[PDB]
Amino acid sequence: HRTVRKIEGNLLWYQQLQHTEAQRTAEEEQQQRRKQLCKEILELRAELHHL
Amino acid sequence: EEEVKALQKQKNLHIRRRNKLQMVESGNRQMCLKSKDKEEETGRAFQEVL
């Protein structure tokens, strides 16, 4: 049961670590979408001010 | 995305309210032009009394 825990928890650990690296590429797409939304908010606020 | 939806809803509200204000203002401007003709008619009736 001690060997099983060492095997499973190291696998779980490195899976979580790879999931954090794959999250960085999703963070770049999310940052691009956030820049797009902030640009759209600024355009909408400017149109609202003119209205 | 909620903020964009809120601003879109506010933009649509301001577009509708501005269109309504322009209808009120156009009706009012037509009433005001005719109320100027009325001010000239009542101004003539006032000169008649003088």
Curated annotation (Swiss-Prot), chain B:
It is found in: Cytoplasm, Cytoskeleton, Microtubule organizing center, Centrosome; Cytoplasm, Cytoskeleton, Spindle. It comes from the Eukaryota. Residues 1-23 form a coiled coil. Belongs to the HAUS3 family. Component of the HAUS augmin-like complex. The complex interacts with the gamma-tubulin ring complex and this interaction is required for spindle assembly. Contributes to mitotic spindle assembly, maintenance of centrosome integrity and completion of cytokinesis as part of the HAUS augmin-like complex. This is HAUS augmin-like complex subunit 3. It comes from Xenopus laevis. The gene is haus3. The chain holds residues 101 to 150 of 597 of the full protein.
